[PDB]
Design a protein around this ligand. Structure first.
Ligand SMILES: Nc1ncnc2c1ncn2[C@@H]1O[C@H](COP(=O)(O)OP(=O)(O)OP(=O)(O)O)[C@@H](O)[C@H]1O
Ligand SMILES: Nc1ncnc2c1ncn2[C@@H]1O[C@H](COP(=O)(O)OP(=O)(O)O)[C@@H](O)[C@H]1O
Ligand SMILES: [Mg+2]
Ligand SMILES: [Mg+2]
Ligand SMILES: [Zn+2]
Lengths: 566, 595, 189, 92, 93, 193
């Protein structure tokens, strides 16, 4: 079943009613190991359950194989299971071999409903919903954000009729509409943290820390699904305005906590690096100036000279920069940026300050968390790598506590290192012209890079993919074409392919830009794997990322080009 | 007027600054006053966080506001330590970008700057005045003056008839402080193309004196100012803080500069069962093979233990290593690494050196016309290692000028009245080529070595590195070098240079093992056998051995044993170390002599 | 042996906190337990807990009060000595009497640390001001202790109005130094 | 609760029978108290803990704990105090 | 402005030419061969890459550098063995 | 300079343009071009230093256009210094130590290799040099640095210079029947550089 926006309180009350007894623990939470939104949502839920004294267990999980293993290994004393960041698309009842009869506790003929020992709650933002979980199952309870009621009526009707069943014509047309619904690609439509914050507001537990976590979760989608962030921004603005004290005339104190809405910028770690490095290592700036070649550096130096900022001053760190220029930055940027085409750098963001400490923005906090996740620190090696990433999850989780600031600083340093490495790898890719421009998609395979050990993590591979997507692909007035990025690792002799959705020119509101673009690589990849003896691993939660053997990539890509479903 | 408000503002920073639940500066002040260290180190990132306006003033006019932050510190210290004390020093820490030494120019005058360099000289401490008591010549009127050492002061010109300049200082009632002068040279890599390195004069006060020694890289925070000595002024830097990677204070006095938390790490590392392997692998990670030379370098860095007998005789505790071999063997690279890992080291070329360049030289002061002594390479490297490259190009006299400093560890001078015996306790690591460039096996060993027996006997271990063309080894070296060219373990198999250097310092200042009787009996039997082996070899060939085996080699074996024991913080040296020492001696010196 | 070497002859700070957390404190219940199950304790009195009424002052043990506050079911009423004005008065008393300690409670430091950590929204004065005042008082008392340590002797010594945490800090130094002095004196005879 | 090559055989016998004595003491009238328990006073009732080394589903007296490496619990200190002592769990 | 970098190279080719050079240079009086010349090959390859203002060293550049070094080595041999040496090294030139 | 360089045979039109007034000697011109463009220096992890410049030696017969090639390289290089066999000294190359006439204190002067930092030092009549003067450039030719310990000065300089040297074989004419080692008086360490 599915719980409407207003049923979150009912679901929370059910969880408290069932899995709350000081004798033993009866709650378990599974989290996507490499999703920041799920991390923040689970932190919010952990605080909420700590307040009410509910004993729980949190298990980081990478891939579906680990999910199946851990669910099989669960004890029978667990009354409620929480899945955050996955499970919506797959068939949980079929995948986990859940037989409703075995899990039934008591059945009432008069009520027409059955009671089950276990309950499974799905907190997923991906789409489309698997109609089996939403409408067929009862053990599975899915936290909806209105989609089922807004735009799933016809699918609901078709599925219910199909279960209910000259008739061949009706049956055919109903399976046809169901297949049409299943044919579309995958996309993210909302943020889980927003859902948990709505629950908290429903039960009245919203405070400043919860709002900070909600803002982090929501802003983690800004880079990819900007169209979700743009839709959720007004609610965050209203919440910040409502929670903030009216009077700010009071002076700073060692305990004062501030949460403002100041002008932010599309610059990489502006407040923890030089003004030069923020422009140099920015996706948008590199896209609009082509910094990977010497002409780009010359153009950036020209821009700085025109703005009236000495090169020595710009390269100085943020804290010690000359304060006249720091104060005038808003005026200097606004007249100068439009000329170089970097005008959209101007933006409004969230900045949080703890008394007498440096102020940090939401975007930089998310960047630090992601960097800690990525580089924080036959089948045996794969298991070891996944264990290391599960370990990094806890570093990133600790970095969310104000008592742990050294971890956040360590994350910022690692983020700067990682961005430098990604810049170098992208420069090497573009200089050699390794991108092949086929008619269905673009391809780029790395075979001998200098820093190829970095891209075994899906997060770092997606970072490089976003960098490439923005530069010389978003711009150049070329047709929108999806891109495939693959990388090799000699230690295991396999590829980590990763399809990437194209993105419209940033900050260009238009009717066509309003429409979202889906990711069809999951369907094509699964079809090809089923048809060919691929040996592909499709266990990753993001269905667009798989693993291939060294000698199968050429047949796989040939069949991909010949498929035409991309 | 404004001065009182500025003082009030800096006093509220020291009394109201908390980052969590601890008052960092109030507690730092109380703890410093309790041990008699009248100063406060403030981080400028914390001041930019309390009130950015206070930082704007301290950076806009540094020599006017710094004197007003010292008096605020003094007032707070009196409030905190005295229940109803000289002016307190302010030491600054900053993370601003470092300006290259040669980029300092008119645009940085009277501003706070951060820079790095190498200290080449330090002066004898002078005495500056901080509170004068004065009197008048004629009417005998008493007054006092108060001086801060921040220049943009002199005795009053007119009394308070009395002629010009009527005041004479009363010394028995005045108070003074300490002042030192330092010369800072820019780092060799920073220097521009085809330019000699440039110097800069620096001065430090009170608790920033006697913090550095010549030849140590430092980072400096100070004020770039000018003093008149026509319409030009000679620039200099007024130090406000010194940061160095070398614990010079620990090295000159006792063991210091190691935190208990830092000390715990060193003990844990020493407890590692295979520390020897880790240290051997940590030296020159980018040079393939040559394991024996790397073990020898570990022993040389560790050093032996020195003894002063009751009768007064002193026994050398340092190890000297010679590397003779063919070109392309990576001897120079090993020397350049050892210069970089050791806490104190000097890299010198035998060709571009001289007898006075090494040891010490007599120099005349152009003003006082008085001769004084300036230390050379072996004095500048005292307590460390000297890397004499191109040891074969050195002239006979300049090489002869090294015997006493290598063996007795002293530099006797008798020149221009100056008569003394300096101290030079250094380890020599030398690299050389044979006479013909390549060690030619056809000719006798006495033909490939021009070094005399006296100089050679002073080396604990002699390595005759020969380059043999073996296809397997050649392929291995080619693969390693190509990997180096196209291309971080740090997983218990190698430790960075900084950690290794700190561990060397800790071991040197913490341990000095001693031989147990079993080791003594073993080493004594081995010496008798080796001497017999040289005699059997000599009887066979009319020629007298070119590589000698004297008592110095027995002492060298003892030193190697003691260094191996010291490597693991073991107070006693057992046979497990004697066997390794004998193996190394056989691999280097008996190997050289056998040929 | 059975007892570690750092717990011999003295208490640890956690032991002092444990001792302090048994003293009564005043709370404002946010629930009405009084009837118009039931607590059953054996180490303290349970009548007060069984008789609670919303927004009615009552006294319970400090650890029970902290446990209730963790649930947002009671608001601790801070002691009267922990207001700004009272701390100013105590600071003045310390300043004017160089030879004596003020009459602060024997648990002022520990209770201050506990309440600042746990109940930050139950004070009627800004927390930063109270932290500053407590810091000042601590510094003055530290000066007085340093001055008074110069009178250790082989006979008794008196430190009146010195709190529990300060005595715990100073117990080893004072006791061992005075023991050595007594040993020397006794050897003399 | 109650390497060895370093000890001499006499010390080995001493240690063995002293552990026997400690267990005998623990078995007496002080059973309700865990004589070889923790000497730090109990401060918090519920603590967050992390699994430090992987192990099966250990079945302690207080309940069943699925000790998956890198997984956190919100439990009562009293229950998991032994596991923390052995090293299977960490307080964080 | 140009600093070419070695990324994609046939390691086996360079290793095999270096070993061949060493073995053939074992002869008395021949031009010395050490690791310095193995590094000289890469230096010359980087120089050739620089001549084209290219940011990455190509396979053709490495082949040309190997040819340069191998020829310079062969020319210095005596007349008697020059023909044999040239025949033996014809693979790389 | 970036159209000329995408063309396909620049690497060989550059070799052709080296001293075009000399008829042949393709190998000499190729070596000169390689030395002029030079390799890339690299510091591995900040611990290992690898030279990045190419040194060339011309060992030929009397009238074979060697000095002319050296003069052309002097013309074309950004920073070049020309030295002849016995007109150069051990301290003339590298660095020397003098007593400043004004301050009357020891100081350091830069020699040929310092003037040739990031440049080329062209030594003619290389085989007629004094042995003492010839052995002086050993450290500079590999480590790219000059170390001086004289008169109380202990400093290390930077000499990032390539050396192109012309020499004349023993007897004035190369004897192709003998090995190279017998036809020159240089030794293994200098030759290997
Ligand atoms: N494993 C190695 N073995 C030998 N040489 C190496 C190795 N790795 C690098 N090299 C190269 O060695 C060169 C340095 O020369 P090296 O120190 O070997 O000379 P040397 O034999 O000590 O001196 P000389 O040739 O004057 O006798 C550098 O070019 C470095 O690239
Ligand atoms: N291959 C050649 N092409 C053009 N001129 C040459 C050639 N070989 C020799 N010469 C002539 O020889 C003269 C230079 O001789 P030079 O190189 O100074 O002798 P050495 O080789 O002893 O230094 C020039 O005038 C030049 O024209
Ligand atoms: Mg050398
Ligand atoms: Mg000539
Ligand atoms: Zn007078």
């Amino acid at each position: 079943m599915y719980y409407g926006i207003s049923q979150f309180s009912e679901a929370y009350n059910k969880i408290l009613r069932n899995s709350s007894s000081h004798s033993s623990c009866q709650l378990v939470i599974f989290v996507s190991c490499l999703n920041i939104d799920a991390l923040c949502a689970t932190k919010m839920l952990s605080l909420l359950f700590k307040k009410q004294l509910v004993q729980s267990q949190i298990v980081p999980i990478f891939g579906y194989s680990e999910l199946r293993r851990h669910y099989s290994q669960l004890d029978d004393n667990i009354n409620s299971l929480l899945l955050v960041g996955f499970g919506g698309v797959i068939d949980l009842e079929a995948f986990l071999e859940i037989d409703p009869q075995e899990y039934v506790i008591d059945t009432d003929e008069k009520s027409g409903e059955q009671s089950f020992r276990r309950d499974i709650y799905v907190l997923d933002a991906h789409r489309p919903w698997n109609l089996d979980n939403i409408f067929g199952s009862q053990i599975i309870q899915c936290f909806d954000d209105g989609t089922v009621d807004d735009t799933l009526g016809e699918q609901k009707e078709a599925y219910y009729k199909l279960l209910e069943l000259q008739r061949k014509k009706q049956i055919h047309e109903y399976e046809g509409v169901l297949e049409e619904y299943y044919s579309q690609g995958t996309t993210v439509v909302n943020s889980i943290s927003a859902q948990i914050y709505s629950l908290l507001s429903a039960i009245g537990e919203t405070n400043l820390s919860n709002l900070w976590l909600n803002i982090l979760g929501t802003t983690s989608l800004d880079i990819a699904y900007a169209q979700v962030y743009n839709r959720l921004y007004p609610l965050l603005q209203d919440e910040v305005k409502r929670l903030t004290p009216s009077s700010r005339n009071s002076v700073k104190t060692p305990d004062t906590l501030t949460l403002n809405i100041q002008p932010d910028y599309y610059l990489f770690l502006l407040r923890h690096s030089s003004l030069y490095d923020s422009f140099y290592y920015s996706n948008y700036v590199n896209a609009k100036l082509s910094l990977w070649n010497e002409n780009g550096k010359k153009r950036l130096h020209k821009m700085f000279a025109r703005m009236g900022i000495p090169l020595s001053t710009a390269q100085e760190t943020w804290l010690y920069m000359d304060h006249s220029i720091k104060r005038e930055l808003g005026i200097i940027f606004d007249k100068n940026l439009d000329r170089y085409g970097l005008q959209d750098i101007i933006r409004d963001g969230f900045v949080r300050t703890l008394g007498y400490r440096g102020s940090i923005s939401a975007s930089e906090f998310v960047e630090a968390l992601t960097a800690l996740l990525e580089v924080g620190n036959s089948a045996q090696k794969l298991t070891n790598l996944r264990k290391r990433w599960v370990s990094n999850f806890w570093l990133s989780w600790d970095a969310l506590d104000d008592r742990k600031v050294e971890l956040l600083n360590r994350g910022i340093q690692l983020a700067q290192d990682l961005q430098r490495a990604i810049f170098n790898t992208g420069v090497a890719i573009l200089e050699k012209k390794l991108i092949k421009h086929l008619r269905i998609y673009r391809l780029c395979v790395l075979q001998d890079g200098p820093d190829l050990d970095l891209y075994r993590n899906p997060l770092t591979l997606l970072r490089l993919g976003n960098w490439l997507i923005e530069c010389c692909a978003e711009s150049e007035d070329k047709q929108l074409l999806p891109m495939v990025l693959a990388s090799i690792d000699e230690n295991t002799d396999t590829y980590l392919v990763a399809g990437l959705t194209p993105r419209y020119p940033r900050g260009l509101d238009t009717i066509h830009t309003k429409k979202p673009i889906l990711n069809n690589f999951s369907m094509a990849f699964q079809q090809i794997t089923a048809e060919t003896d691929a040996k592909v691993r499709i266990d990753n939660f993001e269905s667009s990322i798989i693993e291939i053997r060294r000698e199968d990539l050429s047949p796989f890509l040939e069949k991909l080009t010949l498929s035409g479903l991309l | 007027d404004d001065n009182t408000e500025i003082i009030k503002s800096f006093k509220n920073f020291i009394l109201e600054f908390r980052l969590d639940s601890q008052f960092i500066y109030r507690d730092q002040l109380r703890n410093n006053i309790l041990v008699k260290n009248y100063s406060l180190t403030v981080n400028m990132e914390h001041l930019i966080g309390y009130n950015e306006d206070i930082y704007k003033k301290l950076s806009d006019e540094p020599s006017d506001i710094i004197p007003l932050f010292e008096t605020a510190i003094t007032q707070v210290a009196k409030r905190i330590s005295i229940l109803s004390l000289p002016t307190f020093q302010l030491i600054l820490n900053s993370n601003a970008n470092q300006i290259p030494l040669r980029d300092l120019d008119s645009e940085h005058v009277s501003k706070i700057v951060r820079l790095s360099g190498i200290i080449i000289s330090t002066s004898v401490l002078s005495s500056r005045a901080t509170y004068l008591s004065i009197m008048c010549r004629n009417c005998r009127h008493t007054t006092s003056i108060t001086i801060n050492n921040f220049n943009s002061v002199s005795l009053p010109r007119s009394c308070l008839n009395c002629g010009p300049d009527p005041y004479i200082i009363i010394h028995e009632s005045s108070k003074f402080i300490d002042q030192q002068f330092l010369k800072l040279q820019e780092i060799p890599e920073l220097v521009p193309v085809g330019e000699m390195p440039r110097n800069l004069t620096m001065t430090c006060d009170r608790y920033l004196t006697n913090k550095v020694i010549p030849g140590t890289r430092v980072t400096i925070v100070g004020i770039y100012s000018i003093y008149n000595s026509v319409a030009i002024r000679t620039p200099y830097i007024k130090i406000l803080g010194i940061q160095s990677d070398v614990e010079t204070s620990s090295i000159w006095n006792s063991v210091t500069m190691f935190t208990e938390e830092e000390e715990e790490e060193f003990l844990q590392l020493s407890r590692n069962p295979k520390l020897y392997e880790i240290l051997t692998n940590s030296i020159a990670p980018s040079i393939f093979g040559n394991e024996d030379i790397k073990k020898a370098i570990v022993c040389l860095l560790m050093g032996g233990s020195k003894k002063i007998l009751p009768d007064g005789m002193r026994l050398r505790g340092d190890i000297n290593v010679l590397l003779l071999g063919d070109p392309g063997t990576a001897k120079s690279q090993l020397l350049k690494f050892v210069e970089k890992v050791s806490p104190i080291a000097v890299y010198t070329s035998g060709k571009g050196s001289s007898a006075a360049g090494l040891t010490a030289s007599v120099q005349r002061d152009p003003m006082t016309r008085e001769f004084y002594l300036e230390g050379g390479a072996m004095v500048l490297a005292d307590g460390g290692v000297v890397c004499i490259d191109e040891f074969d190009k050195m002239r006979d006299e300049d090489r002869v000028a090294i015997h006493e400093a290598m063996e007795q560890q002293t530099i006797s001078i008798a020149k221009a009245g100056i008569t003394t015996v300096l101290n030079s306790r250094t380890s020599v690591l030398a690299a050389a080529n044979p006479i013909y460039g390549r060690y030619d096996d056809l000719k006798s060993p006495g033909d490939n070595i021009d070094f005399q027996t006296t100089i050679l006997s002073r080396f604990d271990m002699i390595f005759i590195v020969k380059d043999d063309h073996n296809e397997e080894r050649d392929i291995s070296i080619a693969n390693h070098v190509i990997n180096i060219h196209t291309g971080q373990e740090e997983n218990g198999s190698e430790i960075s240079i900084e950690k290794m250097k700190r561990y060397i310092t800790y071991c040197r200042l913490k341990c000095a093992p001693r031989l147990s009787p079993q080791a003594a009996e073993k080493l004594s039997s081995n010496f008798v056998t080796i001497r017999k082996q040289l005699l059997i070899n000599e009887l066979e060939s009319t020629e007298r051995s070119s590589i000698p085996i004297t008592i110095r080699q027995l002492e060298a074996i003892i030193r190697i044993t003691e260094s191996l024991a010291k490597l693991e913080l073991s107070p006693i040296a057992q046979e497990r170390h004697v066997d390794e020492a004998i193996r190394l001696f056989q691999a280097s010196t008996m190997d050289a002599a056998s040929q | 042996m059975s007892l570690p070497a750092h717990l011999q002859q003295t208490f640890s700070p956690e032991e002092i906190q444990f001792i302090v957390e048994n003293e009564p404190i005043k709370i404002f219940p946010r629930i009405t337990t009084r009837q118009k199950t039931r607590w059953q304790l054996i180490t303290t009195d349970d009548k007060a807990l069984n008789n609670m009424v919303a927004m009615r002052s009552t006294e319970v043990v400090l650890w029970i009060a902290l446990l209730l506050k963790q649930q947002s079911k009671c608001s601790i009423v801070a002691p009267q000595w922990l207001t700004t004005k009272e701390l100013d008065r105590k600071i003045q008393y310390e300043k004017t009497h160089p030879d004596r300690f003020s009459e602060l409670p024997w648990n002022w430091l520990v209770l201050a640390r506990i309440l600042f950590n746990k109940a930050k929204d139950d004070f009627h004065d800004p927390i930063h001001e109270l932290r500053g005042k407590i810091q000042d008082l601590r510094e003055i008392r530290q000066i007085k202790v340093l001055k008074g340590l110069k009178y250790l002797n082989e006979s008794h010594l008196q430190l009146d109005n010195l709190s529990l945490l300060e005595i715990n800090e100073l117990r080893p130094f004072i006791t061992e130094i005075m023991d050595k002095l007594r040993e020397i004196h006794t050897a003399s005879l | 609760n109650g390497d060895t090559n370093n000890l001499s055989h006499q010390e080995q016998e001493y240690l063995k029978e002293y552990c026997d004595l400690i267990t005998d003491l623990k078995s007496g009238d002080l059973v309700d108290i865990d004589l070889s328990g923790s000497l730090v006073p109990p401060s918090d009732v519920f603590i967050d803990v992390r699994v430090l080394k992987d192990a099966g589903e250990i079945q302690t007296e207080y309940g069943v704990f699925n000790l998956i490496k890198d997984s956190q619990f919100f439990v009562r200190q009293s229950d998991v105090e032994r596991l923390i002592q052995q090293g299977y769990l960490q307080k964080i | 402005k140009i600093y070419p970098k070695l990324h994609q190279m046939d390691m086996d080719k360079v290793s095999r030419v270096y070993a061949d050079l060493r073995r053939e240079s074992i002869s008395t009086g021949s031009f010395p061969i050490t690791v310095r010349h193995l590094e000289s090959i890469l230096r010359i390859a980087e120089s050739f890459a620089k001549m084209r203002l290219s940011e990455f060293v190509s396979s053709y550049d490495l082949d040309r550098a190997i040819k340069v070094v191998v020829d310079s080595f062969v020319d210095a041999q005596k007349v008697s063995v020059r023909r044999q040496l040239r025949r033996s090294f014809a693979i790389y030139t | 300079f970036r159209k000329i360089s995408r063309d396909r045979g620049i690497i060989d039109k550059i070799i052709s343009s080296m001293a075009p007034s000399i008829y042949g000697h393709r190998d000499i011109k190729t070596a000169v071009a390689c030395s002029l463009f030079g390799g890339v220096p690299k510091n591995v992890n900040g611990k290992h230093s690898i030279r990045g410049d190419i040194n060339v030696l011309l060992l030929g017969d009397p009238g074979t256009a060697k000095s002319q090639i050296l003069k052309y390289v002097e013309k074309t290089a950004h920073r070049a210094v020309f030295a002849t066999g016995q007109g150069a000294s051990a301290v003339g190359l590298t660095a020397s130590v003098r007593k400043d006439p004004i301050t009357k204190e020891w100081t350091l002067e830069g020699g040929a290799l310092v003037l040739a930092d990031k440049g080329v030092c062209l030594i003619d009549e290389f085989d007629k040099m004094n042995d003492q003067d010839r052995t002086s450039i050993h450290e500079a030719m590999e480590q790219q640095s000059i170390s001086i310990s004289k008169a109380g000065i202990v400093t290390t300089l930077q000499a990032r210079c390539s050396i192109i040297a012309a020499a004349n074989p023993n007897g004035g004419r190369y004897n192709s029947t003998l090995p190279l080692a017998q036809n020159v008086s240089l030794t293994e360490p200098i030759l290997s550089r």
